[PDB]
Design a protein around this ligand. Structure first.
Ligand SMILES: CCCCCCCCCCCCCCCCCC(=O)OC[C@H](COP(=O)([O-])OCC(O)COP(=O)([O-])OC[C@@H](COC(=O)CCCCCCCCCCCCCCCCC)OC(=O)CCCCCCCCCCCCCCCCC)OC(=O)CCCCCCCCCCCCCCCCC
Ligand SMILES: CCCCCCCCCCCCCCCCCC(=O)OC[C@H](COP(=O)([O-])OCC(O)COP(=O)([O-])OC[C@@H](COC(=O)CCCCCCCCCCCCCCCCC)OC(=O)CCCCCCCCCCCCCCCCC)OC(=O)CCCCCCCCCCCCCCCCC
Ligand SMILES: CCCCCCCCCCCCCCCCCC(=O)OC[C@H](COP(=O)([O-])OCC(O)COP(=O)([O-])OC[C@@H](COC(=O)CCCCCCCCCCCCCCCCC)OC(=O)CCCCCCCCCCCCCCCCC)OC(=O)CCCCCCCCCCCCCCCCC
Ligand SMILES: CCCCCCCCCCCCCCCCCC(=O)OC[C@H](COP(=O)([O-])OCC(O)COP(=O)([O-])OC[C@@H](COC(=O)CCCCCCCCCCCCCCCCC)OC(=O)CCCCCCCCCCCCCCCCC)OC(=O)CCCCCCCCCCCCCCCCC
Ligand code: HEA
Ligand code: HEA
Ligand SMILES: CCCCCCCC/C=C\CCCCCCCC(=O)OC[C@H](COP(=O)(O)OCCN)OC(=O)CCCCCCC/C=C/CCCCCCCC
Ligand SMILES: CCCCCCCC/C=C\CCCCCCCC(=O)O[C@H](COC(=O)CCCCCCC/C=C/CCCCCCCC)COP(=O)(O)OCCN
Ligand SMILES: [O-][O-]
Ligand SMILES: [Cu+2]
Ligand SMILES: [K+]
Ligand SMILES: [Zn+2]
Ligand SMILES: [Zn+2]
Lengths: 459, 91, 98, 186, 62, 90, 121, 180, 107
């Protein structure tokens, strides 16, 4: 059979396959954006059809996060190797594992069908009210997808937590990363469901939470209470993969295993109580802003320890071993890229600096370096490491120095200018812009078209 | 390109019979890769990408000569007064 | 001539003494010679602590001495700003309706 | 860390000790099925986690972060005027909430604000004392600090009396310049 | 075991092919996006409009 | 302990650190109190810290201050360099 | 200094040259590198040195290029990336002549400081 | 040498694209009629009947493997008795040339070496300490500036003029006090 | 931290003056994509794949003992590609201790 299969390793493959398929739509949406931003004036989107652009950015953000990266890093690799890293045979809850991947597909079909049938309007991937609750039915459809996706995420989190009961070996660092990510989902998802229901209530049940005398900022607190743990849920599995790749490909025992494990735990605890650095410009109390700013900076301490522990893993490795394997290059590239993304995150953590850089392309570049480069490269690196175990072929990616170099150069061309544009300044979620920002936007656009061409070379 | 034989700091250690094994060469060969024209083309290439990445494409300047001149005149005639070396810069 | 004397003096003073091992290892049996071969994974050649300091110290002097050289010879100081005189602003904004 | 089960582990009395940890570690464990095996696994975990020197660094960090977290939460409820828990003031119109207004001024003047506000001149180059004077009296009059903020502020001199232009850029001098022209009052 | 395209590329030295590919890919990207705007001449980029902006900047001391 | 490598704590204070589990708890408790104390003793106290007439002047302050005071730099530094907007055009 | 002061049970090479040997190499051909510094066909084994005779722990070092080109080969016989050169020849020279190393490092540092300061300033 | 030439003979270039003739010439979709291959298609792939339509996991072709005595066939080891001892000779995998193709000669030498481990416990602990507190010191250096700038934003100022700004879709409305 | 096994001086004394560390090659050989035979059907290609497993390979020392393929994690212990059912017999994680009981010995 193909749909009835409960084998966890098969389901892991399905997660990877589905993420690539949905990735194409996400890439298409991303390509539409940079083509439009090539220069001032409409290029592929009519001025009378600006609503479509708002939908493109809204779906680009939603699909890439919930439908592409999260299934790939939290559903794909973990379902394949996690029961193997544990001494157990298969996943604890086989039937739940089957329904989780099916749920992800159905939610994807609902989302894309809504593009085709409903009027195309957008409110951003964060769905801030009141804009989200004064829109058309496409917003209702997107909410159903998120709620449905939430069901799959929570049941998958329950599945991984049960490994603690049955694990017959040692809890490796990678296993810890998945377990702690599951803990974050369990504590953050129910809060997300509650606020999403309130959005539906206003949209569909004549609720008045998001009109005058009802604080709209209420949504931002509850949403970001899940929002920031989500970004840490995306990256923590990537950290686990990097730890395995560096140790395995260098024949070096992981240094400071317990320090690595405690760093992951510390990040989750801190990541659950710093959500309001997304709300600096709303006008919070003085003491509130100081607290979140102070605690946000503290997240760098555990994150820094992991970076240094990774570096010493690569240092001193035997020279005779060939170092040009794509998996090793991607793992090393992650350290270089993540540091850039994290440092810029610390810059925008300072709230007064953030006043100028909120809702600008500097924030875009910040999370693209971490997610579009780092997370993707970590997912690529893990899949490459498991090529023999997974057994896929008909691609030239294992030893391809051209692909690694071209990818690194061109992605940096896309997003380095966006840091510069942030100070110029160019707002986010914008289709037109002043003529004097064209040069930097043009350079990034040339970077985007180049990256897409490179992907065709792997086949 | 029939490269030369560099004996080295200690000529005695390069005094044996090399047979078919390659013989040591001057260091200039390494930087030219034995004057491979494609290394020299890929070399001219290397400098172009570097230049674009740090200073922009200066190969478009010959086509931008006429429109740059008009921009310079506009700044001098109508733009805010420049002082000293500031006159050298036009936005 | 002077270079040779100073070169010899630094060479003699920098010859390393046996390390004070920070790990618990046995004493090699007396009369034990070479047992391994050159195909073993290469072990990086590391400078002794004295040599590392001297070389590293020289670079620090070089880099900052070069910085001072550029600032005093290659670069120039700002001349005083031009005097500020009362000027006539434009009569009208170019977009003022007529 | 002993390597023989015959040698006992020293334990203190209290709610977080070796004995306290042993009693609870194996409550949910399927692997600690007999004394010998249970002790071996218990000492294995204790050795791996509690005898790891770098682990104690994270223990300090979680304590500090949680301590701040609890204090800020508690401070808002206790002192923030805008936070209501009792209902007496919420049953009256705004002008009648006299008891709640008592929190306003003291909550507006925390110690740290008074200490650090004078150090604005480490950031602002021109007129760092533009907002120092306020005749209303809700806050103290501010006086610029005499030293730079410790840390990463190497751009400015260590003390402001070393800067030849510091006094010329003060709000007082600029006010003198513009008043001489009749340009503005401030 | 590889198609012609990879056998051709993988035969050359990496630092011979790599710099050429980087330049080539960037040039192709620029050319592709320039196709849709051949001969487009907005008025705001004409010399007359450029001068007017300079007049505005002088008046506004931008 | 604060800013202390615990290997030093293990070595120099064996009896105190004999119970590692208890030692870990004290590490958490001690740093919890510090964080709690900072908010309510350093930040919270109202109407305090406004005695700007009592700025601390460390010995390094006086060393540099006296050095410039001895010469004319201190007087020159404090002098207002410019108090007019426009220069006179000849 | 691993062989010199730390470990006395690994073979210790003789420095043939404190500079790399430039050689043209061909893909699909195997080369043998002298690890003792006494071969007369440097940087390759000549058939008469210790490496060729398998004497005193010295053995030839197998090497094969991926692509055709000109490559640098270790002459100091202690480069971490041996047979290929990575700069260990200069490092090992500084150990032998630390006074000279200071002069070179100072000069290199001086140039780097001037250029970096001049451009940024 | 070129190792590909050693096993060139084994690799005969293919005839059909993707390894199959057109279904009209040969119907690879049908189940094979060869005895003992009823579970396979003609081209060798597993038949849909075997894997889907009549899958044993669904109750088709019920055949318990275990026998009455609770035993299943097990292949014994290759035992040898010599020197007054019973020995077992392990099964060695075939030469990698047979499975992969390249001739197993001129293999580069990779010696045995034990794990590369960082030593000097005392030194290592200090490095771990620095990894934690060097970032902490940097954070402390930022903290004081952060407090100061936050206070500057919220400082109470003696403003003399008020401008009210209202955001609407999609324009800005400004309300100002008209002079008397 | 782990710094290798502890060694006593007596353990380093050789029984002959000509002893040197054995030069046994731990490179398993030259490999590439597993190359199947067109004549082999699905069943026999499966046998071919099972006979090309690197994790079933080892290096035999001079005393007859073998150092096998080893990995830090059990992910490298299953057949490549991973079969449907991997760990039919539970992998054993061997711990060591100094405890002993009399029943195991005989005098
Ligand atoms: C009290 C009141 C009472 C009221 C009573 C009222 C009753 C009402 C009843 C209501 C319920 C009705 C439904 C009941 C279901 C019953 C299930 C059951 O028991 O089945 C047994 C039955 C067993 O079958 P069988 O009879 O033994 O025969 C099976 C075969 O012989 C061989 O066996 P097999 O299982 O191997 O074969 C199946 C499989 C075999 O075929 C294959 O698998 C083909 C090979 C793979 C090719 C590569 C595919 C791409 C990679 C995907 C990777 C991820 C896969 C994840 C796992 C699979 C998820 C489906 O083919 C399919 O079934 C189709 C596979 C589809 C894969 C989809 C992958 C993603 C596609 C992405 C699309 C991107 C474009 C976007 C736009 C389009 C969006 C739609 O199940 C099946 O095998 C068939 C299931 C068919 C139902 C599927 C329904 C899907 C609905 C989707 C939502 C559509 C809504 C929106 C429409 C929009 C259109 C544009
Ligand atoms: C701006 C000029 C642009 C020129 C156009 C571009 C031309 C192509 C250049 C390609 C270079 C590729 C190098 C290999 C990759 C690097 C990997 C690596 O480091 O590992 C090697 C190796 C590791 O062991 P391995 O196993 O043998 O190597 C593994 C490979 O990855 C295995 O990789 P594989 O299998 O592909 O094999 C690669 C193999 C074969 O490699 C090759 O085929 C490359 C051969 C060298 C070609 C260099 C041509 C330079 C042309 C400069 C033209 C300047 C004028 C431009 C116009 C200006 C107009 C104003 O590489 C080697 O044998 C390694 C040689 C050591 C690295 C040498 C890199 C520096 C070369 C000299 C650059 C000079 C730039 C001057 C700029 C002045 C501007 C005014 O050791 C090292 O890591 C080497 C340490 C670094 C040594 C070089 C230090 C830099 C040179 C001095 C400063 C130059 C800048 C001065 C600026 C002054 C401004 C006023
Ligand atoms: C004034 C108030 C006073 C109140 C006093 C209250 C007193 C309460 C006493 C409590 C005593 C607990 C005793 C049991 C200890 C645990 C034993 C255990 O689990 O046995 C294994 C047992 C399986 O039996 P087994 O066969 O022995 O297992 C063999 C191993 O798998 C094979 O593994 P292996 O042999 O390789 O390694 C052994 C060990 C290896 O692991 C360990 O040994 C870990 C040891 C440390 C654990 C933490 C202890 C507390 C540390 C101090 C924290 C103080 C914070 C103070 C804050 C104050 C603020 C005001 O494995 C495990 O422990 C596996 C389970 C780990 C679960 C972790 C879940 C995430 C929690 C966060 C981690 C802890 C972070 C602490 C802070 C870090 C920063 C400093 O596990 C299970 O039964 C699994 C059940 C899974 C259920 C999941 C769903 C639960 C519902 C979730 C709701 C949301 C949770 C949100 C969490 C947020 C986290 C950030
Ligand atoms: C004498 C020379 C000059 C000395 C200067 C001294 C300065 C003071 C330092 C202290 C004194 C040092 C004295 C050392 C004495 C020797 C001691 C010793 O033991 O010697 C033997 C010892 C070992 O000997 P051995 O064991 O025999 O092996 C020797 C081998 O050669 C193996 O050697 P190795 O393995 O040690 O090789 C080292 C190599 C190893 O490095 C790696 O392996 C790196 C691998 C990752 C590469 C990542 C590339 C970048 C990625 C960017 C991401 C975005 C991509 C965008 C793409 C766009 C599209 C194309 O390091 C590097 O390549 C340097 C990387 C430095 C960071 C790079 C990033 C700079 C960012 C700056 C801020 C930018 C702000 C921008 C603002 C706007 C624009 C202005 O060797 C050394 O210690 C060698 C040290 C030499 C280091 C020189 C590095 C210079 C780099 C300058 C960067 C300038 C940046 C300018 C822009 C600034 C803007 C603000
Ligand atoms: C995987 C995704 C991911 C990850 C890991 C992070 C990690 C971090 N993020 Fe990010 N972030 C996003 C995804 C992510 N973020 C997204 C998607 C948004 C925009 C959402 C939206 O608005 O739509 C965002 C937005 C965002 C904002 C602005 C929110 C707004 O106002 O709009 C800020 C502000 O501080 C921030 C901070 C941080 C910090 C401080 C970290 C830290 O974890 C980084 C820590 C890492 C380092 C610091 C580098 C490693 C450490 C060292 C090299 C040594 C120690 C360094 C120091 C002490 C400085 N993030
Ligand atoms: C995982 C998340 C993810 C990923 C990969 C990307 C990838 C890219 N994104 Fe981004 N993007 C977001 C998440 C992501 N993005 C979010 C959350 C926003 C904010 C939404 C909002 O404004 O509300 C955003 C916003 C955003 C904007 C701002 C829109 C606006 O405000 O007007 C732009 C503009 O160019 C952009 C461009 C790109 C480009 C050019 C790429 C890529 O082309 C970069 C290079 C990548 C490739 C060439 C494809 C590589 C392959 C994969 C990524 C799939 C791999 C799959 C597997 C391994 C299974 N993105
Ligand atoms: C949320 C409102 C729910 C109302 C419930 C009513 C029932 C009351 C009993 C149960 C709830 C506990 C609160 C009881 C309070 C009794 C005393 C009282 O009235 O206090 C009021 C006073 C403020 O009221 P006002 O005077 O109107 O405001 C002045 C300016 N801010 O309330 C408080 O300060 C107490 C409210 C908070 C109590 C809970 C504890 C606060 C700290 C939580 C820390 C959380 C972080 C983690 C802690 C870890 C601890 C191990
Ligand atoms: C039987 C099990 C019961 C479990 C119940 C659990 C309940 C809590 C679940 C999580 C939700 C937390 C409540 C949400 C708190 C929101 C507070 C908020 O947004 O307030 C901020 C101010 O809040 C703060 O100062 C931030 C404090 C951070 C609160 C975090 C609480 C939840 C933390 C959960 C982290 C995970 C658990 C950690 C456990 C210990 C780890 C060691 C807004 O301030 P202003 O808009 O300026 O208004 C001020 C006056 N006008
Ligand atoms: O979100 O960072
Ligand atoms: Cu965040
Ligand atoms: K546009
Ligand atoms: Zn030799
Ligand atoms: Zn060398």
């Amino acid at each position: 059979f193909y749909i009835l299969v409960n084998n966890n390793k098969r389901i892991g493959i399905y997660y990877i396959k589905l993420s690539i398929i949905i990735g194409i739509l996400g890439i298409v949406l991303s390509y539409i954006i940079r083509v439009e931003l090539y220069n001032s004036g409409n290029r592929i989107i009519k001025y009378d059809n600006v609503n479509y652009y708002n939908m493109v950015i809204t779906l680009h953000g939603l699909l890439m996060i919930f439908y592409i990266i999260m299934p790939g890093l939290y559903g794909g690799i973990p379902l394949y190797i996690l029961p193997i890293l544990s001494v157990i045979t298969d996943i604890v809850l086989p039937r739940i594992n089957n329904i989780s991947i099916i749920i992800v597909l159905i939610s994807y079909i609902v989302v894309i069908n809504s593009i085709v049938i409903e009027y195309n309007i957008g409110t951003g991937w964060t769905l801030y009210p009141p804009l989200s609750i004064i829109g058309t039915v496409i917003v209702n459809m997107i909410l159903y997808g998120l709620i449905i996706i939430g069901i799959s995420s929570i049941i998958s989190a329950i599945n991984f937590m049960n490994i603690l009961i049955v694990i017959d070996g040692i809890i490796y660092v990678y296993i810890w990363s998945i377990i702690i990510t599951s803990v974050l989902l369990i504590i953050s998802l129910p809060i997300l469901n509650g606020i999403l229901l309130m959005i539906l209530s206003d949209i569909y049940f004549n609720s008045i939470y998001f009109i005058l005398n009802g604080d709209v900022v209420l949504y931002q607190h509850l949403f970001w209470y899940f929002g920031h743990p989500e970004v840490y849920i995306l990256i923590l599995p990537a950290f686990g993969i990097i730890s395995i790749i560096l140790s395995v490909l260098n024949n070096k025992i992981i240094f400071g295993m317990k320090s690595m494990i405690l760093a992951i735990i510390m990040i989750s605890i801190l990541g659950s109580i710093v959500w309001a650095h997304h709300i600096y410009t709303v006008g919070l109390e003085l003491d509130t802003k100081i607290y979140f700013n102070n605690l946000t900076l503290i997240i760098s301490i555990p994150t820094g320890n992991k970076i240094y522990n990774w570096i010493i893993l690569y240092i001193g490795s035997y020279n005779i071993l060939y170092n040009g394997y794509q998996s090793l290059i991607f793992s090393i590239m992650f350290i270089i890229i993540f540091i850039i993304g994290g440092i810029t995150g610390i810059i925008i953590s300072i709230d007064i600096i953030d006043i100028g850089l909120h809702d600008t392309y500097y924030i875009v570049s910040h999370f693209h370096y971490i997610l579009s480069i780092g997370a993707v490269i970590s997912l690529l690196a893990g899949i490459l490491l498991l090529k023999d175990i997974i057994g896929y072929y008909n691609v030239i990616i294992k030893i391809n120095k051209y692909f690694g170099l071209l990818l690194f150069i061109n992605i940096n061309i896309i997003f380095t200018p966006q840091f510069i544009i942030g100070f110029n300044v160019m707002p986010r979620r914008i289709l037109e812009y002043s003529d004097n920002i064209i040069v930097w936007n043009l350079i990034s656009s040339i970077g985007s078209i180049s990256t897409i061409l490179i992907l065709l070379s792997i086949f | 390109y029939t490269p030369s034989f560099e004996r080295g700091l200690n000529p005695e250690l390069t005094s044996g019979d090399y047979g078919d094994m390659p013989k040591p060469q001057p260091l200039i060969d390494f930087f030219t890769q034995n004057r491979n024209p494609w290394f020299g083309f890929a070399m001219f290439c290397g400098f172009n990408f570097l230049w674009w990445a740090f200073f922009g494409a200066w190969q478009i300047r010959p086509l931008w000569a006429s429109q740059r001149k008009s921009l310079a005149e506009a700044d001098r005639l109508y733009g805010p007064t420049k002082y000293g070396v500031g006159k050298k810069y036009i936005n | 001539a002077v270079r040779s004397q100073i070169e010899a003096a630094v060479y003699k003073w920098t010859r390393p003494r046996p390390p004070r091992l920070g790990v618990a290892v046995p004493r090699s049996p007396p009369g034990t010679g070479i047992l391994f071969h050159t195909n073993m994974q290469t072990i990086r050649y590391s400078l002794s602590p004295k040599v590392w300091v001297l070389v590293t110290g020289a670079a620090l002097v070089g880099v900052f001495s070069g910085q001072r050289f550029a600032q005093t010879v290659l670069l120039s100081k700002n001349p005083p700003n031009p005097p500020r005189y009362r000027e006539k602003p434009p009569v009208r904004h170019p977009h003022t309706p007529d | 860390p002993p390597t023989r089960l015959s040698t006992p582990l020293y334990s203190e009395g209290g709610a977080f000790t070796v004995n306290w940890w042993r009693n609870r570690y194996g409550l949910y464990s399927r692997r600690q099925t007999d004394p010998m095996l249970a002790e071996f696994l218990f000492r294995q975990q204790v050795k791996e986690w509690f005898y790891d020197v770098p682990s104690y660094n994270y223990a300090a960090l979680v304590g500090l972060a949680l301590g701040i977290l609890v204090a800020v939460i508690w401070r808002h409820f206790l002192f923030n005027p805008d936070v209501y828990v009792r209902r007496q003031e919420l049953r009256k119109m705004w002008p009648d909430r006299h008891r709640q207004f008592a929190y306003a001024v003291p909550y507006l003047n925390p110690q740290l604000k008074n200490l650090l506000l004078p150090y604005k001149n480490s950031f602002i180059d021109n007129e760092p004392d533009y907002a120092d004077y306020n005749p209303v009296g809700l806050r103290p009059q501010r006086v610029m600090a005499i030293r730079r903020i410790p840390g990463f502020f190497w751009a400015i001199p260590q003390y402001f009396f070393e800067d030849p232009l510091y006094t010329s850029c003060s709000t007082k001098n600029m006010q003198t310049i513009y008043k001489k022209l009749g340009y503005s009052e401030l | 075991d590889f198609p012609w395209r990879w056998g051709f590329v993988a035969e050359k030295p990496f630092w011979v092919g790599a710099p050429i590919l980087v330049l080539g890919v960037l040039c192709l990207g620029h050319i592709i996006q320039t196709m849709g705007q051949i001969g487009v001449r907005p008025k705001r980029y004409t010399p007359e409009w450029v001068e007017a902006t300079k007049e505005r900047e002088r008046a506004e001391n931008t | 302990s604060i800013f202390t490598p615990m290997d030093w704590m293990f070595y120099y204070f064996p009896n105190y650190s004999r119970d590692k589990v208890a030692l870990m708890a004290r590490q958490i408790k001690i740093h919890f109190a510090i964080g709690f104390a900072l908010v309510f003793l350093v930040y919270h106290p109202p109407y305090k810290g406004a005695d700007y007439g009592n700025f601390h002047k460390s010995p390094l302050y006086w060393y540099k201050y006296n050095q410039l005071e001895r010469s004319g730099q201190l007087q020159e530094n404090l002098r207002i360099k410019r108090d007019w907007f426009y220069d006179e055009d000849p | 200094t691993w062989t010199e002061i730390w470990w006395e049970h690994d073979p210790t090479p003789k420095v043939a040259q404190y500079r790399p040997y430039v050689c043209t190499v061909e893909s699909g051909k195997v080369y043998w590198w002298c690890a003792c510094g006494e071969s007369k066909t440097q940087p390759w084994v000549d058939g008469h040195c210790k490496c060729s005779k398998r004497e005193g722990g010295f053995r030839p070092r197998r090497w094969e290029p991926e692509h055709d080109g000109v490559r640098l080969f270790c002459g100091c016989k202690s480069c971490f990336s041996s047979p290929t050169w990575n700069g260990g020849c200069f490092t090992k020279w500084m150990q032998s002549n630390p006074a000279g190393g200071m002069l070179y490092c100072f000069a290199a540092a001086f140039g780097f400081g001037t250029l970096t300061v001049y451009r940024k300033f | 040498k070129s190792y590909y030439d050693d096993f060139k003979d084994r690799l005969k270039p293919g005839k059909y694209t993707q390894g199959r003739c057109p279904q009209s010439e040969g119907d690879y979709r049908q189940e094979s009629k060869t005895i003992g291959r009823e579970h396979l298609n003609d081209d060798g792939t597993r038949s849909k009947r075997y894997t889907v339509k009549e899958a044993d996991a669904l109750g088709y072709h019920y055949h318990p493997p275990i026998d009455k005595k609770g035993q299943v066939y097990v292949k014994g080891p290759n035992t040898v008795i010599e020197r007054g001892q019973t020995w077992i000779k392990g099964y060695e995998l075939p030469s990698m040339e047979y499975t992969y193709g390249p001739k197993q000669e001129d293999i580069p030498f990779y010696p045995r070496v034990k794990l590369n481990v960082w030593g000097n416990y005392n030194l290592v602990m200090k490095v771990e300490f620095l990894f934690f507190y060097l970032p902490t010191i940097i954070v402390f250096g930022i903290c004081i500036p952060v407090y100061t700038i936050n206070f500057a934003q919220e400082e109470v100022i003696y403003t003399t003029m008020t401008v009210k700004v209202t955001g609407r879709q999609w324009y800005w409305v400004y309300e100002v006090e008209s002079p008397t | 931290i782990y710094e290798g096994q502890t060694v006593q001086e007596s353990e380093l004394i050789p029984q002959e003056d000509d002893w040197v560390i054995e030069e046994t090659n731990f490179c398993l050989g030259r490999n590439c994509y597993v190359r199947f035979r067109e004549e082999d059907d699905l069943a026999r290609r499966a046998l071919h794949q099972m006979d090309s497993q690197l994790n079933k390979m080892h290096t035999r020392l001079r005393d007859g003992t073998v150092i096998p393929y080893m990995s830090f994690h059990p992910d490298e212990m299953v057949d490549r590609p991973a079969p449907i059912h991997t760990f039919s017999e539970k992998p054993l994680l061997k711990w060591t201790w100094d405890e002993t009981y009399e029943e195991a010995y005989d005098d």
